[PDB]
Amino acid sequence: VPGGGSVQIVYKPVDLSKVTSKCGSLGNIHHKPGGGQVEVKSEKLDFKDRVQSKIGSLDNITH
Amino acid sequence: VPGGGSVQIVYKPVDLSKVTSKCGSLGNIHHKPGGGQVEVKSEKLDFKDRVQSKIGSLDNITH
Amino acid sequence: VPGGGSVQIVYKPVDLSKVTSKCGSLGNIHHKPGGGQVEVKSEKLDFKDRVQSKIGSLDNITH
Amino acid sequence: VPGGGSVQIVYKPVDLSKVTSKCGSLGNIHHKPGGGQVEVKSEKLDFKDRVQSKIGSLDNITH
Amino acid sequence: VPGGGSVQIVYKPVDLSKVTSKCGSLGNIHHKPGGGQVEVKSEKLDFKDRVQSKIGSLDNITH
Amino acid sequence: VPGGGSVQIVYKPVDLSKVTSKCGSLGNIHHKPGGGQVEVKSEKLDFKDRVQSKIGSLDNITH
Amino acid sequence: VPGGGSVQIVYKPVDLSKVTSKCGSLGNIHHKPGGGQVEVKSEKLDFKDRVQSKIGSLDNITH
Amino acid sequence: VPGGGSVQIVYKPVDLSKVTSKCGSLGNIHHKPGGGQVEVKSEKLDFKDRVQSKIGSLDNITH
Amino acid sequence: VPGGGSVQIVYKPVDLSKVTSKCGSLGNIHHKPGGGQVEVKSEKLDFKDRVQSKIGSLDNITH
Amino acid sequence: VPGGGSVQIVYKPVDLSKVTSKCGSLGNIHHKPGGGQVEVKSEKLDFKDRVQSKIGSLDNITH
DSSP, X not given: OOOSOOEEEEEOOEXXXXXXXXXXXXXXXXXXXXXXXXXXXXXXXXXXXOEEEEEOOOOOBOO | OOOSOOEEEEEOXXXXXXXXXXXXXXXEEEEOOSOOSEEEEOOOOOOBOOEEEEEOOOOOBOO | OOOSOXXXXXXXXXXXXXXXXXXXXXXXEEEOOSXXXXXXXXXOOXXXXXXXXXXXXXXXXXX | OOOSOOEXXXXXXXXXXXXXXXXXXXXXXXXXXXXXXXXXXXXOOOOBOOEEEEEOOOOOBOO | OOOSOXXXXXXXXXXXXXXXXXXXXXXXXXXXOSOOSEEEEOOOOOOBOOEEEEEOOOOOBOO | XXXXXXXXXXXXXXXXXXXXXXXXXXEEEEEOOSOOSEEEEOOOOXXXXXXXXXXXXXXXXXX | OXXXXXXXXXXXXXXXXXXXXXXXXXXXXXEOOSOOSEEEEOOOOOOBOXXXXXXOOOOOBOO | OOOSOOEEEEEOOEEEEEEOOOTTOEXXXXXXXXXXXXXXXXXXXXXXXXXXXXXXXXXXXXX | OOOSOOEEEEEOOEEEEEEOOOXXXXXXXXXXXXXXXXXXXXXXXXXXXXXXXXXXXXXXXXX | OOOSOOEEEEEOOEEEEEEOOOTTOEEEEEEOOSOOSEXXXXXXXXXXXXXXXXXXXXXXXXX
16 A cells, blocks of 8 residues: 555445334334444645855944 | 555445334334534645745844 | 645434334434534635836935 | 645435325325534635745844 | 555544333434544655865964 | 524624835735635424314224 | 624625736736635524424224 | 633634735736635534433342 | 633634845745645534323332 | 533644845745644434333234
């Protein structure tokens, strides 16, 4: 799996309910949100700051 | 999986309900949102700031 | 999967309800929004700011 | 999947309801919006700001 | 699995309920959110800041 | 701050640039969009679905 | 701060730039978007689904 | 701070730049987006599902 | 601070830069986004599901 | 601080830079994002599911 920097975010929730009931039968089920508070963050920054300067000579007598 | 910087965000929720009831039978089910609070963030910035300057000499006597 | 910067955002929600009822049978089901609070952000900026200047010499005597 | 910068936003919601009822049977189901609060943002800016200047010499005596 | 920097975030929750009931039978089950408080963060920054300067000589007599 | 349901969305961006330049001076600045990808959503629905029915008796012999 | 349900979304970005330059001076600054990927979602739904039914008796002999 | 359910989302970014430069002086600064990937979600739903039914007696001999 | 359920989300970033430069002086500074990957989620749901049913007697001989 | 359930999320980042430079002086500083990967989640759900049923007697001879 070569490479330089790779982020993968996959979200696949699934919720199903099954209940049986025959003549004179009853049932009650509750299903909450498949997902509950879920986040994925990934930042990648690349910059180059090169400071090049050439200073000969400033002042000499009486500053 | 070569490459330089790759973000993938997939969201595929699914919610289904199944209940049986025969003559003289009753049922009640509840299904909440397939997804609940879900975010994916990914930023990638690349910049180059090169500062090049050439200063011979400023002032010399009495500044 | 080569490349430089790639964002993918897919949203495919699905909600279905199934209930049985025979002579003298009744049922009640509730289905919330397939999706609940879901966002995907991805920014990619690339700029180059090169500052090039040439300064010989400013002032010399009495500044 | 080569390339430099690629954003994909797909939205395909689906909501269906199925209920059975025979002589002397009744049912009631509720279906909320297939989608609930969903956004996708992606910006890509690329600019180059090169500042080139040539300054010989300003002033010399008595500034 | 060679490479320089690689982050993977996969989220696949699943919730199902099964209950039996025959003539004169009833059941009640509760299912909470498949996921509960789950986050994945990963940042990778790479920058080079080289400061190069050449200073001959400043002042000499009476500073 | 009493009340039942209240959404407020205010957007007031501001961008200004200031640069100095004297005889033999030059400058260059760049300003991007004050706002960058910004949305506010808020929905509030309230409905009541009451199902009332009265079934005496259906069939009796040989169904 | 009493009340039942209250959402507030305020967005006020500000970007300013200041640079000095005297005879034989130059500067270059860059300003990105005051805001970068920012969303606020808030939904509030309230409904009541009461199912009331009265079934005397269905069938009796030979179903 | 009494009340039942209250969400507050405030976004106020600010970015400023200040640089000095005298005769024979130069500077370069960079400012990124005041905000970078920022979202606020908050949903509040309240519903009541009461199932009331009265079943006398179904069938009796030979089902 | 009494009350039943209260969420507060405040976002106030600030970025400033200050640099000095005199005749024959230069500087370069970089400022990244005040905010970097920041989210706040909070959901509050309250519902009541009461299932009330009355079943006398189903079948008796030969089921 | 009485009350039943209370979540508070405050985000206030601040980044500043200060550098001195006199005739024949130069400096370079770098400032990363005030915030780096920061999330706050808090969910509070309250529901009551009471199942009440009355079954006299089903079948008796030959099931």
